[model samples]
Target: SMSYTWTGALITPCAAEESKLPINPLSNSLLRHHNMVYATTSRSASLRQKKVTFDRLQVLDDHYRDVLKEMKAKASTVKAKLLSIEEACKLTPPHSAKSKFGYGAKDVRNLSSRAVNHIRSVWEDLLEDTETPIDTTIMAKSEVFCVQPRKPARLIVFPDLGVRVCEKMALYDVVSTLPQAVMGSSYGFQYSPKQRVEFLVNTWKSKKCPMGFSYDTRCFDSTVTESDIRVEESIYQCCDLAPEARQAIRSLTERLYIGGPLTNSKGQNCGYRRCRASGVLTTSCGNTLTCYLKATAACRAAKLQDCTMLVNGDDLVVICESAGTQEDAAALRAFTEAMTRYSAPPGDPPQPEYDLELITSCSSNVSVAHDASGKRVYYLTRDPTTPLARAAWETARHTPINSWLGNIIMYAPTLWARMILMTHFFSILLAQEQLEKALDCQIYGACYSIEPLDLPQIIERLHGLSAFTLHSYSPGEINRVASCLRKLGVPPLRTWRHRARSVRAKLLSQGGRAATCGRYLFNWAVRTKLKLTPIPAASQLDLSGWFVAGYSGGDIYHS
Candidate 1:
């Protein structure tokens, strides 16, 4: 029989077993109830649990969402166009270097120009839609960048920053020297926000959970407290987390499966035939304990029959002992710990077990992204129907670490947008001073367009209507003549710059109005109405331009 796989809608752990997928789950019902009990192996819900391992996370606001959306949307188009994406298959799409948009910068330039003009026509409509001020003065353009605590940047909140932020930030490899710095305090103050934040963060890293701790199912670690509750530093090896109301479920039974979008070292999604499983592992010798890769789960469940183990249907603690490592006695105690969580003063829960000889389907409602069927979009693509293989997706729809007051959705995008735009202006204006700033800002993420000079020509064409039209470039109007005069190394630009300086000076001498417009004065505008700024060389290499030969729709940017 030919087996088929379908793309399953993504879901979070918080959902019910039936709710694991919003789109699809490989159901036997769709195939007349074959009972999908996947149990390859088990024993999990842990980590290093030390403060040193924090991965920085950040709150994503509207601005971040919008920018990311734009990037995603564009990348989606690009990915769609590059189907049959084989690994190391030699993708060589031609690109331009000068323009941020590269080879297709002109097309993007045209698109931006059209959008700009349309925006002008709908200026009033936009004001009404946004309900913000309408001065249209040139707003700041910052070189946008995201910040996160580099170390144990878990999604937890500071007693000061709040718990909800614990998840949003990404991990940064860099750590701040000063953790605590009061806003108005002088440099090298007695306090360190870095140390303060690190101290608070280390509290999470230091968690040991008393060897047999129980917690709400929401915790992956089973010992991790919720976003709030403000956990303080604890050196004690004891805990009493169980409550009369059952703060944690001791043991339960159900068919469980594990899978997720798998990727190799290159980050291209991998098929089960090629992808590796993920999970953390620990080796304990009664007292001495050490941990390793969190990838055992995937390895255990890989294409098992009926269930990873055809176990008898009672829920039991299953332990994964590395082939040659432990004997049966150690396995028994570990199984007890895995299945039966401890509540100290209260009585302990009974542990259940089923050895390989009696193995049946697991009755746990667990599944990963991979177990489903097909894949979905990863990067830019033009086609609407084609799906990228499953490996490209991260778990879709991660649960947000929301504020206690509850979610504030609509305002988030707008607020973040304003902040990023502000940074975009500052960053772009500083481009000439620091090339790295522009690179870091990703201002070059314009679009592939015509070879060089298209942007300047557009600016030239717009000279007459700089003020009334390009309202953002008002009293600070940018004149093609002066802008062209800037030393861009291009003969035309240099020649025109001197001519522009002369004309602007004469105009000012004769009391001409609206004279501050010069190319060097403002930032590079991504106006659809104008052409993109000078496009760079498409192929980059060691003066020899050999890198251009390696260019492809695949690795679009290569040095």
Candidate 2:
């Protein structure tokens, strides 16, 4: 069956879209070549539609059924509950799209009469009708990227506010709890960046002769078949759910979850979708389960040994014992063939890599850098192009989500993140005296409201004190950062070092939390660095629920 059937209606934007980076003094300070930075817009939706729309064929074998049986057994042990209206409303992002039926995200959050009444009606409709296809808005997501292959805008299809809230009520608990219960350590969202690197390192060392590779599914969401979605629903059904919850889940599965109508922002009938919708409460969990199931079965088909998988949605990395060079290569090919037969074809064919650092997954790779004691420290890092491009955009414009802040938090130990991202942004924030203002950024898809002044403590807790004192980065990591800077027309590290010293002095003059940021975040910029010490505040910080799950398209926000 076709993944999508179009009506030839244009996917229109609600308002004017900006595709080029604007020129501003603040933005110029961070990045000189404005032409190199661009954002995806609705203009490229047709191209994206062409790429994503395709026929999918899936054939499940004994290996697939065997894994499904094992998964169902584990899933049966789990218990899930439906959230109340108030509970679900609180989880809604403040800036989420408004409903055509009246009321907005803020109204829902406050549990206004209109929002509550509409939500109740939506829930009632779900229980009453199990076959009617729900309506979803399709729009191009505005995301920053370096000037390269113009990535066609990724389409986000989401239901109305009332239905979205009802979705949270019906399946939020199930999506949150069932994934970890069934997948166990193989679940990628269960680990933090520090923990993730440790797991990869340990898993690599455990094997006698370790070999690893990352699998990239070509449009994994679009590759999802109706059967795959139903299979996912079956897994969720295995959980012990309340009577109302069970009915709601089954109805949602038949209607909204499996497939739905795609309505444009202008309320035009754009098309229909039979594959997984990118924006939904169950997207992350469903993709994780389906990807894991297919990959696990493929691993067995390939005859791979002692395979340890780290799966976060469609992003996958497998570390296992090698069967020599030729055999490993052949096994990877066989794995690719098996995955293709399962309808999840590779974007780039999987290659066997003996080196752990070379196997990139979740857009992050393990890199080594030396801490203060000259002890080797392993941390996570990625190509700085997209992060820097987004940082430049956020510097001049006020955006809903601050990717720069998130990057600084997640990749604090990396050379580019610390030297370029922290130095550039903190300098601007300090000059504006908004260091104490709380900004929202996502870590593993969950939004966190973080203040700039408290970063020293946050970094201390998440990445450890070594994040402050890390130096002598590996050659490969340094070269990648250097190359990225040149490609994006970003200033050299030397200029950033000079700017950081000036920012460090000003921050120190302010004292209190400002001084803490200066001492810790800019320690690398100074000639004589302060003694790196543990932050007492770090111990008291509540980081629970930070990395419990992935909510990329779940519309989740934590207060």
Candidate 3:
């Protein structure tokens, strides 16, 4: 069994040498019609194998040793719990991708004997076959990119049902808890748009020459060698695990992590691979630890003073002291070389910017808004493709997560988020009388059940007084947002503003949470400032801790 391979070309209608049939049946499908295919690994498969196969030894410097010591100490305190099979299965979303096994998500949720028995048997086999690796399926993922041309498709390697379940059993708790402890406030998911901007502003103001740049690893997952996977396992070993958890993790590593066979959509055997699989339970945590390891070491090697790193998987941002102009250029080149030496080469060559806000990580760019007092406010934003896609999906049927509700909660203070995404979806939800319905959505990939009505309180807590008071977008922000709308085939911001008025009026007419939402969420639509009503319920709730600014070494929390 091979770990990585694409058996054959897909040969879609959009392919360069597509089917010359007089008429193609799928020509009108969204992807074909949209002309959406981005990166394909098929051509460079052999080259990738050569790159991922070989190994290299690294010489750790004092700074690298220091960072690793801090990381190991934090990891030592992490007590990850192993969930029961039923409990883990219960946590699986109803809308999760269907299992290749005969039973689907519903069967898993309802604890069907067929699904349970199959899963148990798989788990049993994993326990027995500690030395043998598993085979994984490879598929093309079509996703919308926020920037210019949308819809980029990439190949994803995923473990089979048994291995997937095993992954959750062995690593779910670690994935859920490790990054925050290891990275502290630097863990990107922990931050809100507001917190991130505040950090950038503060960091910039604190330094005479605060050089910042985001490092994007080229085909990050593919670049993760078998050694990298093993290194991740070594880090996980530092964590306090139950004896059973430890054995299961080791077995899981041998069977899934080291490398596995790749099978194509049509069930053809591709080839063996030793690279990191993109679609795995440990993908995020593994990438974060590995990137942090590389970047911290690289920072030391490059000799950048007081380097501050914020990493979320392969996305990295480091703010450190600049060594004047000539030296800064050499320092950046050295940093890039160090990263390349560590096997995590930059996709776009890393270049330091004087302005902290110019560093783009997580596909979000720092943008501006205006508060009630006409003071400028800074926030992070990206193209609204994801929320807009979810909104369109909600129009016809249901979605696992209400993207609109989540967006308004997370980005309530952002002008584009509020004026565009919030207005669009609320109008649709309001029309269908589904505003009060309990829906499931995720923040930082952690699941939560919420109602659209609770959005006001959530917004207030996450964005504070600014949630109800922010209005007016910066000109450049407005331009990008407008361009995004035009490309996505959505209406303009003016259209959103116009619709917000009607949506606001309707909410105001309905009392309770609905009226509260109108007051807080759509207050900008009205002339007179509505009284800012404090939702006392916010005091009782503990939102998985708000993102704070700082680097705290040896930070750890047990789950």
Candidate 4:
């Protein structure tokens, strides 16, 4: 029998059951029904997805032109420069994933002739081939849920190695800086967690009748059409590109962006795609521009009042003046119709919420907490599953350090992160002599190589002084979190707090970097607060460009 794979749904290879085989006693303890997972889609959900895909109710109006024209104007001002092959090679990180072309990033960094020649050929191919489809390698990416009560592992496809490096050369800087320049404060990934939640809270509080809901598009990437890709290309065309850069961009679009073929792990030809490939560097820019186009126009069409938006790719949160209960429902229905007409449809039966705290985006919830000074703090928090999954993988094998560490560092000020994630990871690192080694983690979306020693500086820079001194959370938030933990069968917060004391002592005794980690990360528990030392390298990263910054009702500036 032949198997078929559905597009836009999370699919993974199925394996035969091991019920007939002997199970290890230790492994069995760790393997429960909740943890022993498999991927499956509900019949209703699958049928609903099909209906949405075929629905095709896009409504285009004059409103879209204004936004696109504004984006084009910004693009016209952009002077895209092509990096020399050597310069591009230099930008490749030493620890980047190895290429199938018998060379690695470290070799490329060391100026290995083989690596250089191969990369040069790849670039040459990109410039030469303007009409053929590029073959992309598909890999299953495991991700966490933005909404809680369930954190199922989902699969995302990644492109081939050569195209990835070429993407970085062609558009990495563009992805980092362009949208924020065009979109201003509404661009997500340009602000910190504190900044985003603070904006959301303030916006919610200031309005007499406030209405807010996050917009989620089903199969956002799969729905992107050839015209959409061409629209994105036009935005780049408005830029002043060097001849080489211009040609490179054109070729990349034809071969990679406009559509390509997919190859699975077993070297099977799955199918061909004519839409946006989710794994490319251009995915971020493409999605942001396209989603923004669909939404800003729909807001007007739906007659939403005073719509203020913060967009991070397809994850959007809209804050606007209420149109009243009856009109609000009517407006939401119109918004849905407009979006569906725009080729972007709502998922899981299209639900919206009015409360600010309940609206989740980027896998974070808006919640209130208390600092050591007893001041109220607003921040974004999420369930611990994603980081915990990465941490679990790191604990078992030779995979790199892990995700939970950086998450803990960025969200160190959050009550759950500081108390649980920090203590858990620090204890593991201390046991493994992990502080001496370095690993890369992302802030916003930009990757930075962070050592355990740099945790103090990073945590301080990203989260602030409150990271070391958070006192308590809002009572209701605390109760909700307690319930989540108990339902998930996790250890108590007190247990983590107790474990933290030992980790802090070990860190402080390690002298230099380790001691710095102890002082900054665990300092909230201790009485004496150490003066923060500088982490100049980690401090100056283009971290803000990749975070979500709301229109904070102030002057917006960009580089």
Best by TM-score: 2
Ten residues in a row with the worst lDDT in model 4?
Answer: 550-559
Summarize candidate 1's per-residue lDDT along 1-559 as a digit string, tens digits.
0011112221112222221212222111111111211111101111212311222221223432343333223222211111111211111112221121122322222334543333233322322332221110000111111112211111110110100011001000000111011001111111122221222223223433101111111112212111100110010001222221011111100000011232222323322110001110000100000000001121122211111111110111222322222333343344333322210011233222222212111111111111012321111001100011010010111221111001011011111111222122222223333312212100011112121112222222322122112222111112321232122111232333243444334323433111222231122222233322332321221222111111011112212
Worst 10 residues of 1 by lDDT: 282-291
TM-score of each: 0.16, 0.99, 0.83, 0.84
lDDT of 2 at 236: 93
lDDT of each: 0.18, 0.92, 0.67, 0.65
Over 160-242, each residue of candidate 4 has an lDDT whose tens digit, in order, gives: 55556676677655665667777776777676766777778887887777888888887677677777788888988887777
The candidate that wins on lDDT is 2
Q: Which pairs in model 2 have colliding backbones? A: none
| lDDT of predicted model 3 | 0.67
Question: Per-residue alpha-carbon lDDT of model 2 for 448-527, expressed as tens digits?
Answer: 78899988998888888899999999999999999888878899999999999999999999998899999999999987
Report the error of model 4 at residue 208, Å. Answer: 4.2
Task: Itemize residue pairs with steric clashes in candidate 3.
Answer: 2-261, 2-271, 2-272, 3-260, 3-272, 3-273, 4-273
Prediction 2 TM-score vs. true: 0.99
Better of 2 and 4 by lDDT: 2
Q: After superposition, how far is residue 73 of candidate 3 from its true place, in Å?
A: 3.7
lDDT of 4: 0.65
TM-score of 1: 0.16
